[PDB]
Structures are given as C-alpha cells and as structure tokens.
Amino acid sequence: MERFLLNSTVLLYRLSTVSLDEVSLDERVESSVFLAQYEQARSLPDHVAKSAWSYLVQQIKQRNMKLGPVAILRLIAEKFIKNEKGGPKIDLPMFSEWQTLMSRVSCLPIIACHQVFNPGPASQEYSFRWPLYPYHPTVEDYITRECLHETHQHLNGSTSAEECWLDALKHPEACLRDFEKGWASQEMKQLCAQIDPSLTPRIFKDRLQIACNIREILCRVAQGVELPEWIASMQNPQQLANSTILHNGREYGFATVWPIDDKYSQESEFCWLTGLLEKWRFNAPEGLERLLWIYLLIQNQYLTLLVQRDDFFGMTELREETEKSYLSRFKHAHGAGVYSQVRYLEGRFAPKSDPNKMQKLLFSVLRGYWEYLSAHMSMEWVHEKPLTISQVLDNLELVEPHGKCVELALVPHFIKRKPKNGEAYPHALLFKDLKNQAAILMDMLKSEPRLTGWIRGVDAAANEMHAPPELFCPLFRVLAKSGIAHFTYHVGEDFPHLISGIRSIDDALRFLPLRNGDRLGHCTAIGITPSIWKRSLPLSLSMTKETRLLDLVFIWRELRSHPELLRYASDAAIEAVRLAHKVFSLEEEVSITTLDQVFEMRGLLAESEGLSLWLEEYERARELVKTTGMKRPLKLYKQWLTSDNVRKQRAEYVEVALEYLPDEAVVALQQAVMAKMADRNIAIECPPTSNTRISQYRNVSEHHIFRWMGLPGEAIEGDVPMSICLGSDDPGIFAADLKSEFYHLFVVLTRKFGLSPADALRKVAEVNENGRIYRFHDV
Amino acid sequence: MERFLLNSTVLLYRLSTVSLDEVSLDERVESSVFLAQYEQARSLPDHVAKSAWSYLVQQIKQRNMKLGPVAILRLIAEKFIKNEKGGPKIDLPMFSEWQTLMSRVSCLPIIACHQVFNPGPASQEYSFRWPLYPYHPTVEDYITRECLHETHQHLNGSTSAEECWLDALKHPEACLRDFEKGWASQEMKQLCAQIDPSLTPRIFKDRLQIACNIREILCRVAQGVELPEWIASMQNPQQLANSTILHNGREYGFATVWPIDDKYSQESEFCWLTGLLEKWRFNAPEGLERLLWIYLLIQNQYLTLLVQRDDMTELREETEKSYLSRFKHAHGAGVYSQVRYLEGRFAPKSDPNKMQKLLFSVLRGYWEYLSAHMSMEWVHEKPLTISQVLDNLELVEPHGKCVELALVPHFIKRKPKNGEAYPHALLFKDLKNQAAILMDMLKSEPRLTGWIRGVDAAANEMHAPPELFCPLFRVLAKSGIAHFTYHVGEDFPHLISGIRSIDDALRFLPLRNGDRLGHCTAIGITPSIWKRSLPLSLSMTKETRLLDLVFIWRELRSHPELLRYASDAAIEAVRLAHKVFSLEEEVSITTLDQVFEMRGLLAESEGLSLWLEEYERARELVKTTGMKRPLKLYKQWLTSDNVRKQRAEYVEVALEYLPDEAVVALQQAVMAKMADRNIAIECPPTSNTRISQYRNVSEHHIFRWMGLPGEAIEGDVPMSICLGSDDPGIFAADLKSEFYHLFVVLTRKFGLSPADALRKVAEVNENGRIYRFHDV
Amino acid sequence: IGITPSIWKRSLPLSLSMTKETRLLDLVFIWRELRSHPELLRYASDAAIEAVRLAHKVFSLEEEVSITTLDQVFEMRGLLAESEGLSLWLEEYERARELVKTTGMKRPLKLYKQWLTSDNVRKQRAEYVEVALEYLPDEAVVALQQAVMAKMADRNIAIECPPTSNTRISQYRNVSEHHIFRWMGLPGEAIEGDVPMSICLGSDDPGIFAADLKSEFYHLFVVLTRKFGLSPADALRKVAEVNENGRIYRFHDV
C-alpha cells in the first residue's frame, strides 16, 4: 500500500484542496489510497486491499508515530534498504519488488530517510548515489573483473528520470511551453488523461509552481531559521500556485538561499531532505506534515508523466545546457571507484537535422567525453581547450583504450514519423527528410575523415508500423559506402498480431544490409510465447490489408518446409491469392509464386520503380529488374505502390481471428527465424527486464529473455542458440542503471528459477559479454 | 470494442455536457473510448486498441451508416444473434464472448436491433421474456427429458437484473431513498466511486430523471406522433434532469399518451425499441440519435452499479408480482417447465407480522402460477391467508413437470461490533430473534415445514465465524428443519485460512448427511492461479493466524513427506499463543487443538424451551470431563480484553508460507472429509467474476471439480457439485444460460464430444436433485 | 562438515565424554534438523526424548518443559551475558533488552536467566556426561551435515580450508582422503546428495616447517592428478575455482 500512498493523483487532488487545519482526513486518505490501487492494480482483490491497509495503520500505531511522509518513508527504510559492506544496499530477496516499486516512487526521499534514521557505518559520509542496487560478491567480482558492456544508451536528455524532475524546477515556464506544444497532440493528451483525467496545462503549471514553492518553504525549515511569518495565511495549499500570497497586502517572496548555490542538484536535494527529516525525527507539525505529501505526490506524479511521455515523442528543455549532460552521464556511467566498471558504452543520440546544430551537438558530446577523460587520465593534451570538434579528435586520438575507462561509440538513431500521401509512394515525405538527414550525417564524415572512428553505426528507432523495414534499405546501403561500418534496426512492439510481428523481423533480415556482426534491437516478437501473448486479448484482431497479405505470404514461405504443419502453408497460399485479387483489382489470375516474387522485390526504391553516391544506388536498385526478365512482378509492384485504388485498399483494415494458427505452428515461425538469426549471426539488444510497456507478464518470471538464455521449462526444444546483449534504453523506471538491470537478471535466476550463483552468473555473463563481442567500437 | 461505446462512464460524461446544437463528435467519441478501454481493460496494448477501433470506424463507413447507438447495435446484432430453429438464438462459437458482454451491456437493445434489421422467419409471433440462448440438440433434449435444478436462487429483486432498472423508473424518488441510505456508509461511497468517481446523490437523480425523460421523447417518435415543437427550445440534455421544459415561458410537462398501459414493463420497452429502430432503418436525425445513445449509456451504467451494489420502498414495490413473475420466468417457454426442483432464499425479517406478509405473498405467488398452469379443482378460489394457501397447496400432486418450491431463509451477518465480552453479540441476539420468529410461525402451523426446508447463512466469513451458528443451526434442527446450507464467504485473507474456514464448518456445524456448502471456492481454486497478481506478502488477523496454524498441524502431521511444515506449524503456533494469550506458564500445541476443539460450544454456555435445553447441552460436557485449563483458556479466549485486543491485531504472513504441493495437500485433505459426510457443494455461475483472479472462464475451478484431466490434480477425491444462479454478475441471466455456458466451454475449449460434454455437466445438474431439500 | 563419519571414527573409544551443556545443545539441535526428514525421524523423536530427560537433570526444575520450549530457550543465546536480566554498547544492550521485553517470551526468558546465573545450573553444565560413540548411524550424521550444507550455501558463506599438509586431525593417514575433496565434488569420494560449497584457500599453520600457498596449491594439484587420475586441465579447473573463491569472498575494498 506504500506504492499507492506515494503515487496517486486522487490523493494529490484531495489533499491540496483541503485546508491545513482539519486533522480528521484519516478516512479521506483511506478511501483515496484504496481507489488508487483499484485504478492501478485492478486484479488485486478488495478484501486483501482492506487488510493490507489495516495492517499499515496498525503498524504505524505500534511504532508510536504520526501517519505521514516521515511515516511511510521510515517504513520503507527498514523493509527494503539495509546497510552492507559497500554502504547502503538492498536485500537480495526483496530487490525484485523494490524494482517494481521504483517505477512509481522515487528513491531520493527513501534514500535520505534511510541515512537519517539508520546511519551509515563509522559515521561515514553519504552523498547522492546511483540507483541503489543489491550486493552479492559473485556479481560484484565479475563486474570488477570484466566491466559491463552497453549497446543502447540514449545520450539525449538527463541521465535518468530522477534529476530530470529537478530540471523542471529550474525553468517551469520552459517546461510548460514545451508541454503545451505536445498538448495539442492527441497522444500526449491521451497519455496525460490516463494518469489523471483532470490534467490541464493551467493546473499543470499550478502544480509545478506549487512543487517549487513547497521546496522553498521546507528548505527554510531545514535551515533552522524561523519562518518568514506569512505562514499564518497558509490555510489552503492551492495558494502556492502563484508564488505570492496577500497577507496584509505586502510583498512576499518565496525565493530562499540554500547552503550551496546550485539548489537544483542531487547534492542540494539530498542535503535538504536529510536535514528536514532530522528535524522531524521524533515529531512533526501536522500542517507541514501534510505539505510534504503534496511535494512527494507531485514529484512522483510528474515522473510517471515524464517517463511515459518519453515513449511517444522524441526541444528548448533539452537545450538548457546541451553539453554538461553528457559529462554527467559519463560520470554516472563509471560509478564510484578506480575502475569504471563499464567498458564499452554505445551512446545513441538523436540527429538534429541542422548542420550548424548538428556540428555543435556532436562537438558537445565528444568535448564532454574529453572532459570526462581528463579527471581520471593523466597525460599531456595537445589542445587544453579545443572549443571545436576538429581539435577534440586531436586530443582524443592520443588516448588509447586500456579497459579502465568508458569507451564510446556514437550511433545516431533515425526517427520515423507518420506517412504522408502522394508523391509516387506513401512513405516519401518521411523519406525526403531522412534523405536530407543523411547529408547532415555524411558531410561531416567526408569533411573530417577522422570522425569516422567514433560514429560507428546508425539506427532507425521509432517504431515498426511507422515505416516498413525495406524503406531504410536506400539509406543504410548508401551509408555503407560512407564508412558507417555498422547498422542496427530497432523493431517496434506495435505488431497487431504475433504472427505479423515475426514477419517484420524476417523482412528486416532479407532486405536490410545487415552483414555479419550487425545488431537488431528489441526483438520481442521472436521471444514471447504465444500462450503468454494471448493473455487478455480479444478473440478477433485487426490490421491493414498490406500487413495480412504480407503475413500470409510470410506464412507460406516458412511453413511449407516442414513435413508437417504444411496444411497451414497450403491454406495460407489459398487465402493469399484471395486477398491479392481483392487488392490489386486484377482480372487475370495471380499465382502464389508470383506474389512471393513481387513482394521479394520490395527492397527497391519506388523512384526507380517507374523505369554521387545516391544516384549510383538509385540506378543500382533499377538494374536488377532491368537485367533479369522479371518484368511482370515489376508491373505488379508498380501497381502495388503507385496505384491510388491499390493504395487505398492497403490502408483498409481486415478482421483476423486471434487463434488463426495453433501454438505449435506459431512457435515454428519463431524457431525458423531463430535459425535465420544464427545463420546471419545477428545479435539482439534485449530491453531491460523491468519494462511495463509489454504489460503481458504478470511477473518478471515470464519475461521472454529467460527463454533466450535456455533455462529448463521456459525454453522449448528447437530454439536455436541466440546472441543476446543487454541495453538500458527504455527502462520505464525512475532511476535506472545497467548494473541494476544486471542484478535484476541475476536475482530472478537465482531465487525464483532455482539456480546456483555460479551457474546464474554464467548465463548472465555470456549475455553481458556479447556486448563486447558485437560492439561497434573500432578494433 | 463495441461494448465501450455502450457502457462507459467517461463517454457518458462528455456527451451529456455537449449540447445538441453541434454534432462534431467524431474525435470526442474516439478519444473517450480509448480512455474508457484504459479504465476497464488495462492490460490491452495500445497498438491493438487503436487497430481495433479503426476497423470499427471503417466498418460503419462501408455500411453507408453514421456512428450512433443504432450503428453499434447493428454490428453487434449480426455478430452474435443468428436465427435458428427456436427463433433467434446465439452462435455457439461466439457464446463465450456474449456472456462477458452481458456483464457490461444489457441485451434488450441488442435483441430489438436483430429483430428489426433481420426478422425471424415467416413473421411468427415472438415476444422477449427470457435471455437469449444458443441452440444445441444434445443439450436441448436433456432439458426436455430431465428438467434443470436450481439451488441458490434468491427471491429479492426480480426475475433478472435489467427489469429492476425498469422498476427504478417506476419510482425515481424512491431510488434516492435507497441510494442515500447505502451512501451514508463509506463502504458504498467507494463502491460507487469505483464505477463513477464523479458521482453524487443529486447527479444520480439527474441521470434517472434524464433517462426517463429521454424515454418519453423517443416513445413519441415510435408512436408516429409529431413532436410537441419544444425541440427548438431543447439544445442541452441537462434540461431533461428536472422533468420540466419551457416554451416562451410556459409550463409544459413531459407526459404523453401510451397505447401500452404499463409503460414501465419489459414488454413496453421491446415494443418501443422495435418501432424506434424500424423508423430509423435508413437515416436518423443526429439530435434524436444522441438521446438514444445517452439512454443506453445510462441504462448500462446503472446496471453496472447495481450488480456491485447487490453484493424499504424497493422491498415493498409490489411484493407479490415479482414472486409470480419469478416462477413464470423460472418455468421457461413451452407447456412443460425447464426447471423441476427450485428452492428459494428469502430474506428473513425481524417483525413477526412482516414475516406473515412475506410468506403469504410468496406462497400466494406460487399458488397463482400453479393455478394458471395446472387447471385443477381448488378448495379455496382466493386463499387470502397462509392457512388457506396451505389448503390449496396441499391439494396439488408432485408430477415434476411444474416448479417444485422449497423456501429457505438465509441468515445475514454484520460487522463484528465491540462489547458484550465477544465481538458477535448484537449479531447473535438479532439472529436469535429471527430464528425465534420463525419458530412460533412453524409451531403455530406445522404444515409450513413442508416448504421451509432449510436454513442458510450468506453474508461473509470475516464478519462472523462459522462456529457462531452451531447453537443456531442445532436449535433449528429440533424444529424439524432438517437441512442446513452454509454459504462460506470467499474473502479469505489467505488461501490456507480459506481452507481452514471450510474445515470449521464441517467439524463444528451440524452438517448432517444431505446438507450443502455453498461457494466453496477456497477448496476449489488452484494455488498456482491464486498467487497471480498478488503482493509478495499478505496480512491477516492474529486469531485467523493462530487458527490457521493449528488447523495446518491437524492435517499435515499425517503426511510423511509433508511433515516439516506441520512441525514448524506447531512451533510457530505456540509462540503466537504466547503473544496472543499473553500466558506466562507453559503451553503445549496439543492443548491448542483441544482448546479450539471446544469452539463449537455456545456463546453464553462458556460461562456455564429449546434454547435453555441447548444451554446445558454443551455445558454438561465441559464440566463432566476432566480438563479445566482448556475451559480456563477458552473462557480467556472469549471474554478477556487483552485477548480481544490481541486477536483484532494484524500480522504479516508470507504469500508462499506453504508451497504449492502443501496447499494442494490441505485442499485435498479437506476434500476427503468433505466427501465422507457426502455434502454437496453449490457452484456459483462461471461468468460471475467476483474473485477476478480468473482471466477467462476456461480456468474456472468448476472444471477441476468435474474431473477434467487437463485441470484435475492427483489425489483429488471426487466431490458432488450442484449448480446455482445466485449472483450472476450479468444483467440477463438464467440457469439454462449458465448450463449452455458450461457446455460451450467444454465443447470448444476442451474439445470434448457433445455427447460426452453433456454427460459431465449432467452429473453436476442432477446432483441438485440428489441433494434436494424438498420433501419426498 | 567435511570429514566423512566413517573416517572420523578411526581409532576412537566406544564411549565418548562431553559436557552436559554441549550434550543438551546437541539433542535440541538434532531434533531441529531431523524433524524434517521423514525416514531419519526416530532419532529426532529420541532426540526430543533425551533432550527433556537431560534438561530436567540440568535445570532440576519440577514442572514440565517441552522440546519446543527448550528451542526458544537456546535460540536467544545471542543475547549479551549481562543483558540476560533485561559508547555503542549501551544501545546494543537496549536492543537485547527490548527484544526480551516486547515478545511474549517470559517462561523461556526465566529459564535462560537461571541457565546463565544459577550456581546449580552452572555446576551441572560443566559436568561431564558419558555419550555413546555411535549415538547416530553413519547416514544420520551425514544428514545433519547436508542440513548445514543447505544452510551454508543459502547464506552464501565461504569456508576457509586448513592447509592440506596440516595433518593435525590425526585421522587421515594420507592426504588423499582429506575432507577438502569431499566438498570438491570428486566422483565416489564425494557423498551423494551433497550441496556445493564456496571454498577459499588459506595457509596459516601448514604443519610443515616452510610452506607458501603456492606449495599447497601444487600439493592439491599433485593429489588430484596422480592419486585421483584427473587430467591436468581438469585438475587445474577444480583447484582454480577454489583459489578464485579466495578472490570472490575477499575482505579487500572494491
């Protein structure tokens, strides 16, 4: 019930409006927390829900201490956190549920409470830390021996969601202005209403200003100075939304001085919380008790809004500093110690589309990397102040890898958008910007060849249905001639059908120039068990006709091979020609073999379908059709692309049964792709385990990664061994680190799957080491 | 996705505040549906949700149709209802989703659309009185030759859940009176907030007034009469929340002429609905269509609130017509009834004169049905009193083909109120009066014992422990009741405790051979499926914890392999006994079993006509046998303030305290004791997802009881299971509908042949006849 | 937990002598870790029988004391000696003090105060009682060991191994049958149903005039290669992980 008492929009709305004097809200908070769990965890029964809260009230009473923020934070302090050899750590048996808790409640109030009420050993120092992670000597020694390897790290924005909350306090106007830019979009409006329907930019600004002013008020309590005496007018907490009250109509300023200049840092925030709870160690005023919830509820509520919104949309907020984030992220990367404990870090960065902005951005990342190396390394620097990207490479080329630092390989990731109608093929306005985007990324490499050694790859990471896999063939192929040397593709999890999801990954292999050693990202479709996937799904699914028509063709290609299960392959071909007649509107008969050939030729650009690096590849795609006699599939493919009647049929949605294929048939597709995966030797950047975006696993015990490792029971026979690497890209949690994800994998294997620590490390270590094996870094 | 446009609170709110002057609602209806889907089915992914919504939009488009309540009803009608031999029926493959749909949306609008847009063959007469069924020859003939049997069939309310909404329209003012009475308690405050957090008693009257006035408007459309020309004065649906309208500052009501006299009857609704859709076969005005949408949203929302609220003026609405309508509804279509043995659970009352009214009204209703069906000479043409009803009822001969009735009062429990040395004291003195009121009525006219065949106690288990009813049921036994069914409340804080409660009822209460135990979910659920979507740790009262551990040691001491848990149970139980009893001296685990074995003794006899005879009955056994410390502890266990304080305190219990095999071992251990006494078990309807742990019906625990190899577990001693429709959780429900539901899931999900699928469920159905409460 | 029970009985008297304190702690412990096993249960029941018999002799009390009651009495032995009646020691005493107060343990608390601070009890504890050598069979002692082996592995607490050349046990006529190899997992010599250990390597008192860890590290390799017939690549692997366990469980900073 601690999760629903620190993150509940119903509580914040109730508490903020209610005045401070009345103390009889014990029933009001009781109902609000109960409704919040019914909104969040519907499957939790009410009778246990009432019982769990009644224990908490009883547990609070026995401890002889008032209900409040200090009450709940103290309660979590002993339950989860417990000091160990390295300092403050988390119990191994309860780290699995701690990670779930962090998705809704931040750690800084809990971390500060643990130090204040359970001081560290030897009265030692304790400053702001990384996301608290458990201690186990087996895992700790391996990480010290071999540093962790990272493949999917988003360099843009803050390091984690925690400090991004602080950045909101710095410039509340900037956040509101950017928020209203996305408010007009339905997706953000839809997502905002999901967390709280009564969320409006007017009241969003009110809450942010309220959160800022509470920090001002409580800081003065932490300093120990007597309050500026306008507190007598503080009757309703809604009064803090304007940053000024009218008590006798004189000037009132909420601005206060902090012990350190940067009030918006982790150090300042941690010192504030530790001092505040110390002054409330025995008893606290009820009025200031209630206000701390107001800050905590909004601090948790905003983070959930921020982490969920980051999934959808990927300006001025990210340009506040534009350089210090990368240095701080690198500082957060290596942890605390002589050894960086993370060796090969592939930091993705969003392209900027502006040549001056792109050069400034790329300079800031490498300059931040150079500044990070300066503190640890000690040798003469050719230019002590580069102030330009060309001089940065001069300083960096002297540095040699030694395994004690955090090696880097920037990989920009292209962002897809919605297709725009017309101009000879639907995904053209997207293509035109992307074709323009390549020039922004190509000129720098051909103007300064030395920069090629750090831009080790490219990516296309927005979603799957945003753009077809073959759409990026012209971009990747022309990038190949420019010395990119590595390509990775992030398959989105928006597959309408699990059968259709397997089609996208296979099409990625066949069309993209994924050479040996290249990587794929987020390949959930070939990991999720069909029995697991059908959990709480309607019996009738729907998708576009072009999806089903390709899905049917994909089924026939894979299933005919097996001596059995060919009945589905034969019937799929029967149904495939049925849709081709409906789509192409052709009087002549069409064969299944021709449907294979026309969709196989999909890898060609539609500009050359009517018949400098770009022109050569432009003609190269056209020469394959011209040289061979396969002109009729070209005729069909042109109709498949440039015909409005055909194109309008493609966007039409169709009714497809959920149980279209039996479970063993669907698993046959996955194992067929697993064979193709190993054949090309393509690695997969597995997403972090504690990801709620799938929301189909009731617990982490069912996560598809554990099937890829090869544990008994979960893995089915015939699963070809696969190359899996780890990456902390979209954790969905407040504070994330690849070390924390590494422990979460280790804990689950040891505890709830029945494995010895030696074996459990062995399976995780080979996955972690795959980051080194399939690294894009220069060798 | 069709349900979210017919039963959705958020979509109702947006449409109600939008005036009819502008009908730019294509985006507004779409966005709310996604939110509405979000607040009902969280786990459904967004990419699938958007894909499914887009198909429905184009499905309307290709139909040269506009998005409206008529549009939704059409796609639903052609998807689920297909005409068959017995008129309109339901597709067998699509019956599983239909029962889930009735848990959110009523069926009367749906049947009206199918009849209008796809009429039955030959235009043969068809009037809606029963919920829709799918036709299967194998099961239908079983109905013809062997009528169904119903055990847990409550009498309060009406035949189904939908027509109670019509009764709500009869007295909208009375609805507030019952709504306000419940709303005073905070328990109903959150229950209403779960469906509509923005709900107030005044708003509730608005919607009821809004729905009635919309019905009056649309009835005028169906009549073919011209509107009263206040449409120009009407632009906001909120204007209908006061039953008054203005036209140039003139008082104009909403009354209209009805050719059907009972405007608040199901027959009137279906007649109105069919005419409405017929006139809107091709096109409908946007303004009038939205009113129909609001009325559908109101009707589905209130019934959604009603089914949760069920688990004064409404009680005395008609009090005779519902009883007669129930038996006619229970009889079914055709000359011969589909139900043979039907026993009813009527709410007892604390007024002896009110009891005479209650029994007379239901017995008068039973005789009225029998007189209408079986033409046979009666001693009295109008009985007018219970004595004369028995004179009429004693004449009839049981030939099976008509409904056989056996009324069974169901005792109700309340929260444990502090004071009087034990937490259930105002309860017992109230229950003692209720039993005594029935006692004098029975002894006055002994002929009543042929219909008051049993006693039931269905409120909860946490509120009152089973052993409190031991003095109650036994004193009923000396009155010739001879049947006692105990409906265990399945709100167990822990599954082990839930199994513990079942053992208490068997050992303590006088469950004689032939009795029943309703809602035995605890001894039916799979431990692996119970742990899902639960926290790592649970919480339950110390008294529950102490009784749980002692019960564990009673059944786990026998197992050789499952022995380490029993030994640890004994170790932990005595330590809790030290903490609970606050005892200083030594205490032994054997004494705990001996002490708790005495829990079947009376409430007041622990300190020591029918009641006084029962008083010393359990007092003599305590004194005569040697031990006194168990009495001293039992006296302390009951009437010690510190013990009472300690028992109410909560403790932290691990979820996996007993492993999966161990819990199954307990579950099978009580099953053997369950089957030894030959006690039948009432089964709740499968579609009733009160437990909400079952994501789909295919994993319902009834399948494990029936012995399906895909779900049965080793060591499962077979039981005897009887069906029952008591708390369906759906608006349109019937036993035959549930019977088909059992057959459909077995035929489709499990693959059993239709001949064999009926056989497995026929055993369940006939068990109600084997363990019937009716006299021979 | 290393020496095989059959090996330990080499040239021992048929009747051992041990203090009543140790004997009483054994019988309670035997009942603790043998009530779970279904076939090794008679000894646990007899352990309960002998525990109350001896406890009555020791405590000299006239009332009844149960085996479970004895379990709590010895369980809270972690309390401070001066805290039985109840700087950084004052709060540690309070935690020992507050544990006694809050719980319902009053009768077990009373015995422990008598256990520590009664002249008659202390005199009986130091007294020596004759115990049969074969009080438990060969398998029963193994079951007790593997019960601890479960506890050691679950707690993940490494074991320091004494130097192999340190033949101070006086039961191993040769280093071939050393107890380290039983934990090693070597075929045959390792008892069936064992639980793996984490074993570091230490050279504190090697028992010979000069021995570095490297000498022992070779010494284990020679026995594995020659006396056990293991290939050098396979022989090194077992010794390597033992040596590596000395790094995994190091006391040094990270």
Q: What is A141-172 written as a DSSP string?
A: HHHHHS-EEEEEEE-SS-SSHHHHHHHHHH-H
CA dihedral C60→C64→C66→C69, nearest 10 degrees, is: -70
Of A441, A201, A440, A157, the closest CA to residue A322 belongs to: A157
Judged by CB atoms closer than 8 Å, whether chains meet at C35 and B567 is answered as yes
- What does DSSP say about strands A87-90 and A148-154: parallel, antiparallel, or unpaired? unpaired
**Residue C23 neighbours by CB under 8 Å, 6+ apart:** C54, C129, C131
Chain breaks in chain C (C to N over 2.5 A) after: 86
Question: Residue B31: its chain A contacts at CB < 8 A?
Answer: 186, 189-190
CA–CA dist B523, B665 (Å, integer):
11
Burial of B226: CB neighbours in 10 Å, binned 0-12, 13-18, 19+? exposed
Q: Phi first, then psi: give them for residue B245, nearest 5 degrees.
A: -135, 155
Quick one: which H or E segment has residue A48?
A: helix A46-62
Q: Cα(B57)–Cα(B46) distance, rounded to whole angstroms?
A: 17
CA-nearest residue to B460 within chain A is A47
Strands B251-252 and B245-246: antiparallel
Residue B100 is classified by DSSP as H
- For testing the chain B interface, which of C61, C68, C70, C102 should be mutated: the one with the most B CBs within 10 Å? C68
- Chain C residues lying within 8 Å of A136, measured CB to CB: 156
Contact B43 A536 (CB under 8 A): yes
Instruction: Report d(CA B37, CA B35) in Å as an integer.
Output: 5
Please tell me which of the candidates C64, C68, C103 has its beta carbon nearest to residue B571.
C68
Phi-psi domain of B400 (left: phi exceeds 0; alpha: psi -120 through 50; beta: other): left
Name the burial class of residue A533, with classes exposed (0-12), middle (13-18) and buried (19+) by CB atoms within 10 angstroms of its CB: buried
Distance between CA atoms of B367 and B194, rounded to whole angstroms? Answer: 42
Q: Residues A634-655, buried b or exposed e (16+ Cβ, 10 A)?
A: bebbbbbbeeeebbebbeebbe
**Contacts with C72 from chain B: Cβ below 8 Å:** 575
CA R_g for chain A: 28
Closest chain B residue to the Cα of A1, Cα to Cα: B535
* Min Cα–Cα distance to chain B from A261, Å: 43
Name the method of structure determination. Answer: cryo-EM
**B-side interface with C, Cβ within 8 Å?**
560-561, 563-564, 567, 570-571, 574-575, 578-579, 582-586, 588-589
For an interface test with C, the pick among A62, A63, A138, A143 (most C C-beta atoms closer than 10 Å) comes out as: A138
Compute the nearest-CA separation of C68 from chain B (Å).
6
- Tell me the two tokens of residue A718: 């015939």
Are the CB atoms for A648 and B58 separated by under 8 Å? no
Residue B84 has φ and ψ, to the nearest 5°, of: -140, -165
Contact yes or no for A222/A279 (Cβ under 8 A): yes
Other Cβ atoms within 10 Å of B195 Cβ, number:
16
Q: How far is CA A730 from the centre of its chain?
A: 1
Backbone dihedral region of B41: left (phi > 0), alpha (psi from -120 to 50 degrees) or beta?
Answer: beta
DSSP annotation string for A571-634:
HHHHHHHHHHHHHH--SS---HHHHHHHHHGGGS-STGGG--HHHHHHHHHHHHHHHSS--HHH
Interchain proximity C248–A136, CB inside 8 Å: no
Percent of chain B that is helix, strand, coil (3-state, to 5): 55, 10, 40
Report whether C176 contacts C4 (CB < 8 A): no
3-class state of residue B642 by DSSP? helix
* DSSP characters over chain C: --S-HHHHTTT--SEEEEEHHHHHHHHHHHHHHHSS-SSS-HHHHHHHHHHHHHHHHHH--SS---HHHHHHHHHGGGS-GGGS----HHHHHHHHHHHHHHSS-SHHHHHHHHHHS-HHHHHHHHSEEEEETTSS-HHHHHHHHHHHHHHHHHHT--BPPPPTT---SS--SSGGG-THHHHHT-TTTSPTT-----B----S--SSSS--HHHHHHHHHHIIIIIS---HHHHHHHHHHHHHHHHHT--S--
- Contact present, B360 and B385 (Cβ < 8 Å): yes
Q: Where do we find the tokens 């043969």? A: B124
Is the CB of residue B462 less than 8 Å from the CB of residue A47? yes
- What kind and span of H or E run contains A56? helix A46-62
End-to-end CA distance of chain A: 51
3-state secondary structure C207-231: CCCCCCHHHHHHHHHHHHHHHCCCC
Residues of chain A contacting residue B538, judged by C-beta atoms under 8 Å apart: 48, 51-52
The three-state DSSP-derived secondary structure of C134-146 is CCCCHHHHHHHHH
Q: B722 - beta bridge partners?
A: B682
Report CB contact under 8 Å: B54, A652: no
Residue in chain C nearest A338 by alpha carbon: C254
Instruction: Find the closest chain B residue to C109 by CA distance.
Output: B584
Which residues precede gaps in chain A, with C-N > 2.5 A? Answer: 314, 611
The span from the CA of B736 to the CA of B146, in Å, is: 12
Q: How far apart are the first and last CA of chain C?
A: 31
- Decide if B571 and C63 are in contact by the 8 Å CB cutoff: no
H or E element, residue B149? strand B148-154
Beta strands (DSSP E) in A617-706 are 653-657, 683-686
CA angle B196, B198, B201 (to 5 degrees): 90
- Report the alpha-carbon distance of residue C19 to residue A94 in Å, rounded: 42
Cα–Cα dist B346/B366, whole Å: 14
Given an 8 Å threshold on Cβ–Cβ distance, is A698 in contact with B533?
Answer: yes
Of A522, A528, A459, the residue nearest A724 (C-alpha): A522
Q: How far is A102 from chain B (nearest CA, A)?
A: 15
In 3D space, the residue among A407, A475, A412, A472 whose CA is nearest the CA of residue A438 turns out to be A475
Contact B737, B89 (CB under 8 A): no
The conformational region for residue B726 under phi > 0 = left, psi -120 to 50 = alpha, else beta, is: alpha
Rounded Cα gap, residues A654 and B580, in angstroms:
65
Q: Closest to A757 (Cβ–Cβ): which among C156, C247, C250?
A: C156
Return the partners of chain C (3 or more C-beta pairs < 8 Å): A, B
Helix C107-116 vs helix C119-126: angle between axes, to the nearest 10 degrees?
70
Task: Encode A84-128 in three state secondary structure.
Answer: ECCEEEECCCCHHHHHHHCCCCCCHHHHHHHHHHCCCHHHCCCCC
Contact B483, B515 (CB under 8 A): yes
- Cα-Cα-Cα-Cα torsion C165, C170, C175, C179, nearest 10 degrees, comes to -100
Print burial letters for A104-113: b (CB count within 10 Å at least 16), e (below 16): bbbbbbbbbb
Residues C3, C180: Cα–Cα separation, whole Å: 8
Contact check, Cβ <8 Å, C107/B585: yes
Q: How many beta-carbon contacts under 8 Å exist across A and B?
A: 111
Q: ∠ CA(B10), CA(B14), CA(B20), 5° rounding?
A: 150
Cβ atoms within 10 A of the Cβ of A135, count?
A: 19
Whole-angstrom distance, CA of residue B763 vs CA of residue B760: 6
Closest residue, chain A, to C154 (C-alpha): A756
C248 CB neighbours in chain A (<8 A) are: 137-138, 141
CA distance, residue C97 to nearest chain A CA (Å): 17
